[PDB]
Design a binder for this molecule. Structure first.
Ligand SMILES: C/C(=C\[C@H](C)CCCCC(=O)O)[C@@H]1O[C@@H]2C=C[C@@H]1OC(=O)\C=C/C=C\C=C\[C@H]1O[C@@H]3C[C@H]1O[C@@H](/C=C/C[C@H]1O[C@H](C[C@H](O)[C@H]1C)[C@@H](O)[C@@H](O)/C=C/CC/C=C/C2)[C@@H]3C
Ligand SMILES: [Zn+2]
Lengths: 133, 133, 53, 1111, 176
């Protein structure tokens, strides 16, 4: 099964995503709560819009502006760290957040029935007293 | 215009999760009493839970005007979710609307059309034809 | 009347040549937990030995 | 009559009504000057007793006066709110976008209990948006109107249902106060009680009875003669006084240890002190009228009392048994009854004064919290009320109500009737009330106390039916916020002229006769059995001795707008609804000619709508002009009257004011001196008088389509004016600052040949679609170019032109001459928004002729767009050579039951040609009750049929008998009413005669260029990639769900795929579609839609592995 | 209280502002509320700039920094289902007539270069980098051509004189 969008599937298999698949999809751990610099209006480094993580906002333009044309393509500027491509892959590439402590998905926890408590044969209130400490 | 930025209400949830994870990592590498550490982990857990679905557990996280933040599950469920809206239908190009009047001399396979509107509809066809001529 | 917006980025309109590119090296990187990563640098490019992968 | 400049509109009014129509905007003006505490209001309220009249500002302050600290160590009073003048006049505020304000000054005073000093400052409380002359407000230049709102009055509402299971009629009562909490005395499914209070999930009577401190025997001498009291005395299950105190308190707290002494006083706090729980003076009067306790004493004690509480539970259990009347120990008897909320004795009207008073109350509370907060933090002998009081949340609350509320509204002013009927609306459910989706149809129905108190005809016809009803004609608001209705009282058969204003209560105490009742011309009836309205909402016949009140006139129950539809008593209520909504949608024509047939309401409706400049003091004209009128008064003084020529209204339409008087004219006080938009000669005029035949003509008038003659187009009979405003601003930015100039990059001087030397277009420049109005250029910055762009620049020698042209262009369809150049500048030191260096507004106006598609209507909801404008030669013409103007459809008349328009057409022909009945026998029999100076009439003479006392069938046909000829001897219309028409197209006479006449039709604000709207490729959305709909943009059409269903049902898969991918969201597909069209090649295959990839990315982002398999 | 104020300066805005600009924003807001209170009316920014001993343009820049962004997820229209984020004209999107215009311009320009000689077309193409994306210089063109760079400049002047016939280039005058 290919996600390369050739307009023929005949099949669509939803399923739970592992932590390995989440870190497999991403393009680097976003690790700062800084979205856009207040002065230069450019995306911050390693924040929620970081062009090294997701991609460039200007078409085939590295962030420092060294490489700037389509001849430089598919490469990464060694200074600015942004892979040169189009701007529309910023619609596409996901990032991940690594966690110091693990986390339970609320979609398996606050359900009727709670699938966590039904897999481990436990009360809902057992879970609300475990993973709320 | 005038530089009025417009966020998308997920950046605040992502900022809260990012900040709580960074703080938790800092306190873990520092060494802290376990009340503090478990409290930060509980805050991280509630943050992730509200990020997926705000208001699923406890009180919904709101913002200015006490309006609840449109979390990730809010993009799917409800009338403003992706499924219902994508099922609701989209606006289309090459379209148009007008008021109607009776056409008592037209044949049955025929409708009148104002030239000021049909000029706007068939603009690419009319451009191609009058650049061929 | 209509309020407009612009996401602050440049949009050009060129040809996506998959043939006429700047040629380029590929540097393999090894992380702390042995993870391999192949960063495409340019040909005319100093390769930093360290890299946030 | 009784108005000096009224035109001689003769009337068929047989009934002589002694009561005149009131000062129609009194609902706005009296409410607002009650809030001010105007001296005029002060003496007016001192007229009807009321020894302590209080302005609502003084009410809110005296409620808040004084403000202690917590420890009792100091006190902060408030005293005497007073005003300065206005900051600016009316049109200056409207031009400069300032709110028509006035400052508030308040004699504030701080007092320390420690040592004792007065600190009597004069605190400026805020600039206060004053009401204009016409009862409106101006906020940011726009004309804003606050609307009166209906709510349930605070009080005790005994309402019971019977269950489907046990068939026991359980009796609840909601004691709903103003501002406080809801205590209730319900009845459970058993023989117990539902005294569960503010949703505390369980409470019987006994726990509050011994939380009152009483014993079981003290319950017995209070509740004593019921199985309810026996079963609750045994089903107490919590016995002991302080036991029930702490039981109430632990039900109140839960989550903390209790204390018994606070249980006795928090009860007195939450219901019996007047500091956090206060049903108003209105609701307290309602309660003291309901139980009859405080009958000999004036209205006070805005909190509760235990006597009234136990009387309420006694009333509850007695109506649970079913009783006729109850006297409490300590009260005169009152009838034991249910409570219907929809009765107008229980529905009070919160007008604009009550609304502003509530917002001042919440602002004073939210600043009082900061006052009490900083009272302890501030040190003694160092403070003052200026150092204590923050008026910023108060002025924020005022501005947050006047802007961005639900009740504040743009004054819907396409004509003065829509101004008048956007005032005097009652909104039944909204903010502080039920939601629109939450409310059923019990609100939407018309309770039988609406007669004279709210018009049942006028309402929106959409989903909001019955929620938005206007006020009646003679209705008048009580000081208690109730809707009085005047009545002529009848004593011993003699109906006096003592007009008594009655609320719904005294309506229900009595029985009420009708205006269509034959009086003896001396007071008494001539028939002993009279129609009457029984107080249970019923109709009876009655001996002519027991009625004590009569209606003041007919038309008492009708709206203002609906009072202007003639022959209303023949019309159906649905088409009258459409006509009354159609009245306040006309546009002002350039000629504005008066209807040949109306009611007696046009004149007073015009001069009370405010959109006609009135001769204020009786004088003589010193000089007339086109912009001003200098009257010369009878004692020295002079006064100009500046006309507002070509003012833009709130819907683009013109608001001209042509003067009507001449040089040597002596005027009187209260005389019309200048007609407004839709006024002729003083009275109202929403359209023109037009010849009309009722034949079905060639399918062009098919299914309520109208045709017109070309005489309307050529002779400019139906021609509005649409002054449209365009507005652009010069801001600053990161790359520099935008600038307005003649210099626009890559452009010619040909398009630039109309604008001035500095960029704006000059006055009088005719524009078209896509022209330039304001030449505006911003710094683009400097970007790298495409090599082809560089090569063309190198060939032509032109530079980069590094500044981006984003100039204001006149958008699609709009055209016409440029009237005004309203331009402001930050460098000219006017107030401007943050960063805007220059603001420029340009008014363009187009003189829209009538056209096919413009929604026309009569006065009876007989609407319809113009199907085809025929030339005047092939239009079916009357046998003397007169061509008719419009031609309706016959089949829309009978099956809609609006033959009021046919009667109006016959009467319009009669009043057009004029008549003179024979005097040889004097009065013919049909002409008997027909009033005098109507037996003859000159041609083109207006008449007025009133609403429910007007023309009749016999009078109309007998008047249509003698219908004096045109110029020759030619009675063009028979006694049947029809006429013989030669066909203008074929040439033959039409084989049967056709009804003709002069209907009075209007042109509505639904014109075609407001609606015609197309798009090939325009702007797109931001987050989604759909074409951004809306006529403000180029705009697509919402291809909704049912359209997807229908095109599924055709099986047309391909067109559905186009409509959902490559006209909607396939981003790379759209440009390939455009390329294939202009290259003339085949349309490529649709790719994956963008919204599906958005769904895929969201579902991947929800930690769901959405694997999409191919094989 | 230092760590609390530091956290409220750092992580309380959707865009990060360094703490000194947050401090001068708070000082401006304190001065502004105090001036609106004690002045009675609204203060002018020049008077505020005098008050904080700074320039009014700096006051305007600080006020421009002070405006917090609004969310796109509020029901701004009268309909509850109406979304504010829909009614935004994407002014940085594909205008889609200029793209096909640009492609057609490329093809017509290729035809115009076809109407000239081989050396001329190669000189203009390698000069402006139209064939690859890399504008080489006259020295590189003479390097690949085996002639002087002054010869390349003479060829350049010849070709630009050849291009500037309006009889030849009216079709390209149309393209701007
Ligand atoms: C549904 C609604 C208002 C609709 C927009 C129009 C009302 C129905 C009109 C009709 O069909 O007859 C309600 O409006 C408010 C409270 C609840 C609702 O709020 C709602 O759900 C909707 C809006 C609530 C506040 C809006 C404030 C501002 O929005 C603009 C400026 C401010 O007010 C609005 C003003 C609308 C005036 C209308 O006036 C009507 C004609 C046009 O429909 C409009 C010109 C006239 O028929 C007029 O006589 C009727 C006025 C309505 C009476 C009081 C309404 C208060 C204008 C659109
Ligand atoms: Zn870079």
């Amino acid at each position: 099964g290919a996600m390369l969008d050739v307009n023929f599937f005949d099949e669509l298999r939803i399923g739970l995503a592992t932590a390995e698949d989440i870190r497999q999809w991403s393009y680097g751990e976003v690790k700062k709560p800084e979205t856009i610099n207040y002065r230069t209006l450019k995306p911050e480094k390693d924040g929620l819009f970081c062009e090294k993580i997701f991609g460039p906002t200007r078409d085939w333009e590295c962030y420092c502006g060294k490489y700037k044309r389509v001849r430089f393509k598919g490469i990464i500027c060694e200074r600015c760290g942004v892979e040169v491509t189009r701007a529309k892959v910023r619609r596409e590439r996901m990032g991940h957040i690594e966690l110091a402590a693990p986390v339970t998905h609320i979609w398996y926890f606050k359900g009727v029935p709670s699938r966590l408590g039904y897999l481990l044969d436990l009360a809902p209130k057992d879970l609300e007293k475990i993973i709320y400490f | 215009d005038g530089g009025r930025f417009a966020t998308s209400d997920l950046n605040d949830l992502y900022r809260r999760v990012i900040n709580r994870n960074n703080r938790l990592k800092r306190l873990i590498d520092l060494g802290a009493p376990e009340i503090i550490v478990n409290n930060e982990k509980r805050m991280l857990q509630e943050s992730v839970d509200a990020l997926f679905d705000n208001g699923r557990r406890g009180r919904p996280v709101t913002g200015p005007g006490n309006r609840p933040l449109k979390s990730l599950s809010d993009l799917l469920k409800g009338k403003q979710g992706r499924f219902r809206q994508n099922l609701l239908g989209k606006r289309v190009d090459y379209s148009g609307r007008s008021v109607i009047v009776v056409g008592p001399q037209l044949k049955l396979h025929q409708c009148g059309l104002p030239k000021l509107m049909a000029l706007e509809l068939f603009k690419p066809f009319v451009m191609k034809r009058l650049v061929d001529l | 009347r209509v309020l407009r917006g612009s996401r602050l980025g440049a949009v050009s309109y060129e040809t996506d040549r998959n043939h006429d590119l700047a040629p380029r090296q590929i540097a393999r990187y090894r992380t702390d937990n042995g993870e391999e990563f192949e960063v495409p640098f340019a040909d005319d490019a100093e390769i930093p030995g360290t890299w946030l992968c | 009559n009784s108005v000096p400049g009224a035109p001689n509109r003769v009337s068929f009014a047989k009934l002589r009504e002694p009561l005149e129509v009131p000062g129609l905007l009194d609902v706005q003006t009296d409410s607002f000057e009650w809030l001010i505490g105007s001296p005029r209001w002060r003496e007016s309220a001192a007229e009807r007793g009321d020894v302590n009249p209080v302005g609502g500002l003084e009410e809110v302050l005296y409620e808040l006066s004084p403000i202690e600290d917590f420890s009792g160590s100091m006190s902060l009073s408030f005293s005497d709110p007073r005003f300065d003048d206005v900051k600016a006049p009316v049109d200056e505020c409207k031009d400069k976008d300032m709110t028509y304000a006035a400052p508030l000054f308040v004699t504030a005073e701080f007092i320390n209990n420690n040592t004792g000093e007065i600190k009597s400052q004069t605190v400026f409380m805020g600039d206060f948006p004053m009401m204009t002359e016409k009862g409106t407000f101006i906020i940011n230049g726009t004309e804003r109107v606050v609307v009166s709102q209906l709510v349930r009055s605070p009080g005790v509402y005994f309402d019971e249902t019977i269950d489907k299971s046990t068939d026991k009629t359980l009796h609840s009562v909601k004691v709903i106060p103003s501002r406080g909490a809801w205590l209730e005395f319900d009845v459970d499914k058993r023989d117990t009680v539902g005294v569960r209070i503010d949703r505390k999930r369980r409470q019987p009577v006994t726990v509050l009875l011994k939380a009152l401190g009483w014993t079981s025997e003290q319950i017995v001498e209070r509740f004593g003669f019921s199985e309810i009291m026996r079963s609750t005395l045994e089903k107490d299950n919590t016995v002991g006084t302080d036991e029930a105190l702490l039981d109430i308190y632990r039900k109140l707290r839960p989550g903390e240890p209790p204390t018994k002494e606070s249980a006795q006083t928090l009860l007195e706090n939450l219901f019996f002190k007047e500091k956090r729980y206060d049903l108003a003076r209105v609701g307290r009067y309602k309660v003291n009228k309901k139980l009859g306790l405080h009958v000999g004493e004036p209205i006070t004690s805005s909190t509760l009392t235990e006597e009234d509480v136990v009387a309420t539970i006694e009333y509850l259990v007695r109506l649970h048994e079913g009783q006729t009347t109850m006297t409490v120990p300590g009260g005169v008897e009152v009838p034991v009854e249910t409570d219907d909320i929809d009765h107008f004795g229980n529905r009070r009207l919160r007008t604009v004064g009550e609304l502003i008073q509530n917002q001042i109350r919440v602002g004073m509370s939210r600043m009082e919290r900061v006052v009490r907060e900083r009272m302890t933090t501030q040190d003694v002998e160092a403070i003052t009320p200026q150092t204590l009081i923050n008026i910023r949340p108060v002025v924020a609350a005022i501005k947050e109500f006047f802007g961005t509320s639900q009740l504040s509204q743009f004054m819907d002013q396409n004509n003065p009737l829509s101004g008048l009927t956007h005032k005097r609306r009652l909104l039944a459910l909204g903010p502080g009330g039920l939601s629109r989706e939450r409310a059923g149809l019990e609100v939407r129905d018309v309770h039988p106390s609406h007669y004279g108190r709210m018009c049942p005809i006028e309402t929106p016809e959409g989903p909001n039916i019955g929620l938005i009803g206007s006020l009646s004609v003679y209705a008048r608001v009580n000081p208690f916020g109730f809707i009085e209705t005047p009545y002529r009282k009848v004593v011993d058969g003699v109906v006096s002229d003592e007009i008594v204003y009655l609320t719904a209560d005294e309506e229900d105490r009595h029985v009420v006769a009708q205006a269509n009742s034959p009086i003896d011309a001396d007071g008494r009836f001539v028939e002993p059995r009279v129609l009457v309205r029984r107080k249970a909402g019923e109709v009876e016949y009655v001996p002519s001795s027991e009625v004590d009140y009569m209606d003041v006139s007919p038309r008492q129950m009708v709206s203002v707008a609906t009072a202007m539809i003639p022959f209303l008593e023949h019309d159906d209520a649905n088409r009258a609804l459409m006509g009354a909504n159609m009245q306040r949608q006309a546009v002002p024509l350039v000629r504005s000619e008066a209807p040949l047939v109306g009611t007696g309401m046009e004149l007073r409706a015009a001069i009370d709508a405010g959109d006609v400049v009135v001769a204020e003091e009786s004088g003589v004209i010193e000089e007339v002009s086109a912009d001003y009128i200098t009257v010369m008064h009878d004692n020295g003084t002079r006064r100009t009257y500046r006309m507002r020529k070509f003012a833009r209204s709130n819907h683009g339409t013109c608001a001209n004011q042509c003067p009507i008087v001449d040089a040597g004219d002596r005027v009187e006080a209260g005389q019309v001196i200048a007609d407004g938009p839709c006024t002729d000669d003083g009275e109202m005029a929403l359209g023109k008088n037009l010849l009309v035949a009722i034949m079905p003509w060639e399918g062009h008038n098919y299914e309520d389509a109208i045709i017109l003659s070309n005489r309307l187009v050529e002779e400019d009979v139906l021609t509005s004016i649409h002054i449209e405003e365009h507005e652009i601003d010069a801001r600053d930015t990161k790359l520099g600052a935008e600038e307005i100039t003649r210099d626009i990059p890559n452009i010619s001087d040909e398009v630039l040949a109309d604008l001035d030397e500095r960029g704006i277009v000059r006055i009088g420049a005719e524009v078209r679609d896509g022209d330039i109005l304001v030449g505006k250029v911003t710094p683009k910055g400097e970007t790298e170019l495409t090599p082809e762009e560089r090569l063309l620049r190198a060939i032509f020698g032109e530079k980069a032109r590094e500044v981006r042209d984003t100039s204001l262009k006149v958008p699609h369809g709009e055209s016409g001459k440029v009237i005004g150049i309203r331009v402001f500048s930050r460098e000219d030191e006017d107030e401007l928004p943050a960063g805007v260096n220059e603001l420029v507004r340009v008014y363009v106006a187009q003189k829209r002729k009538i056209s096919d598609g413009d929604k026309l209507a009569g006065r009876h909801g007989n609407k319809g767009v113009i199907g085809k404008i025929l030339p005047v030669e092939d239009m079916p013409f009357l046998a003397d050579g007169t061509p008719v103007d419009i031609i309706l459809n016959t089949h829309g008349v009978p099956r809609r039951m609006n033959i009021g328009q046919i009667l109006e057409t016959h009467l319009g022909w009669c009043a057009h040609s004029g008549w003179k009945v024979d005097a040889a026998k004097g009065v013919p029999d049909w002409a008997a009750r027909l009033p005098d100076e109507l037996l003859e009439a000159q041609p083109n003479a207006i008449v007025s049929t009133p609403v429910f006392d007007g023309a009749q069938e016999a009078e109309l046909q007998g008047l249509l008998s003698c219908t004096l000829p045109n110029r020759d001897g030619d009675v063009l219309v028979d006694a049947d009413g029809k006429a013989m028409l030669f066909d203008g197209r074929s040439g033959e006479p039409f084989p049967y005669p056709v009804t003709v006449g002069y209907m009075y039709i209007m042109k509505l604000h639904h014109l075609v260029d407001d609606k015609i709207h197309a798009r090939s490729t325009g702007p797109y959305s931001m987050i989604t990639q759909q074409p951004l709909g809306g006529k403000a943009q180029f705009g697509g059409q919402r291809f909704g769900e049912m359209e997807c269903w229908a095109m599924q049902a055709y099986g047309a898969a391909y067109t559905l795929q186009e409509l959902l991918t490559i006209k909607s969201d396939d981003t790379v597909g759209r440009v390939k579609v455009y390329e294939a069209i202009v290259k003339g090649e085949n349309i490529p295959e649709p790719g994956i839609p963008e919204s599906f990839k958005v769904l895929l990315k969201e579902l991947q982002s929800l930690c769901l592995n959405v694997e999409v398999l191919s094989s | 209280r230092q760590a609390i104020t530091r956290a409220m300066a750092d992580q309380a805005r959707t865009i990060r502002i360094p703490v000194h600009m947050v401090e001068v924003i708070n000082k401006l807001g304190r001065i502004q509320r105090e001036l609106l209170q004690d002045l009675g009316r609204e203060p002018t920014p020049e008077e505020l700039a005098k008050e904080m001993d700074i320039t009014p343009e700096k006051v305007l820049e600080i006020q421009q920094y002070a405006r917090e962004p609004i969310s796109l997820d509020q029901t701004i229209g009268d309909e509850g289902d109406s979304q504010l984020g829909d009614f935004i004209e994407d002014s940085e999107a594909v205008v889609a007539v200029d793209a096909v215009s640009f492609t057609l311009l490329q093809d017509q320009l290729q035809s115009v270069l076809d109407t000239l000689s081989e050396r001329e077309a190669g000189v203009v193409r390698l000069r402006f980098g139209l064939t690859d994306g890399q504008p080489r210089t006259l020295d590189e063109i003479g390097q690949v051509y085996g002639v002087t760079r002054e010869r390349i400049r003479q060829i350049e002047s010849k070709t630009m004189s050849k291009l500037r016939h309006p009889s030849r280039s009216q079709v390209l005058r149309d393209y701007l």
